[PDB]
Structure formats: C-alpha cells, structure tokens
Amino acid sequence: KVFGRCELAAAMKRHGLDNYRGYSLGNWVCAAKFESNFNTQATNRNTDGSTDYGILQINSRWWCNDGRTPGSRNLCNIPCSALLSSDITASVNCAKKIVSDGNGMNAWVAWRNRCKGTDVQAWIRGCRL
Ligand SMILES: [Cl-]
Ligand code: NA
What we know:
It is a single chain. By secondary structure, the protein is mostly helical. It has a single domain (1-129), classed as Orthogonal Bundle (Lysozyme), CATH 1.10.530. Helices cover 30% and strands 6% of the residues. The protein contains four helices and three strands; from the N terminus they run ααβββαα. It has helices spanning 5-14, 25-36, 89-99, 109-114; strands at 43-45, 51-53, 58-59. Helix 1 (5-14) crosses helix 2. It is globular, with a radius of gyration of 14 Å. Bound molecules: chloride ion and sodium ion (NA). Sodium ion (NA) is lined by residues 60, 64-65, 69, 72-74. The active site is at 35, 52.
C-alpha cells in the first residue's frame, strides 16, 4: 500500500508513535518518506546480505527473520514479510523496540541524514489528526 502523508500520520498517531520516546509525529513521517516513499512493500538489500523491509526499512540482521540472513537475530520475533503488510501494526511495534534500544531514531540513516534538525512538523502540516 502507498500511504498518503496525512493518512500515514493518522495511522501512526493511532498506533502510539506521536511523541514516543520524545520523537514528535513529524519525525516518524519524515523517516517513512525517505526510507520507503510511504510504500509498505519497499525492500532493499544491504552490502552485508541483510534486507530492509517495509515502511520503516527494518533490517533482517537484527529485527526480523527472512530465513536468508545467516547469524542474524529476530529481536522483534516476526517474519520480515509481516513488515510489508498494508497494516503497519507489526512495523510500528517493531520500531518501538528499535527506538528504545539506546540510539533513538539515529538507528534510521535517512532520519539522521534527512530529518534530524530539519522542520519535521512540516511533514504533518494541514493533516486532520
Ligand atoms: Cl533519544
Ligand atoms: Na534475522
């Protein structure tokens, strides 16, 4: 599913991401934009042979089982394919573990490089939330 900006903001607020660990809704939408272009089906292979999955490009090296990343953890205890669903529940719950693990939203390179220190509130401007 390819979300609208405001549709995704609204889906994310309902799943408890608005200000989760001090990160305003704008941050999560900005990261989804540059990670996946708001496409739940987004996949990308890493140089190490791990794969990034879904709206927030969650990595098979640490977070999900794709059965092809040797010596990887499944710290969200899910198949990576659950992260590609039009239901973002599995992606949101897993992102809550990731942003709690000590590095906050710096775990997402696109956030660090494209969202951090920008006006992120711009990403939810005009949305009915
Ligand atoms: Cl933090
Ligand atoms: Na894994």
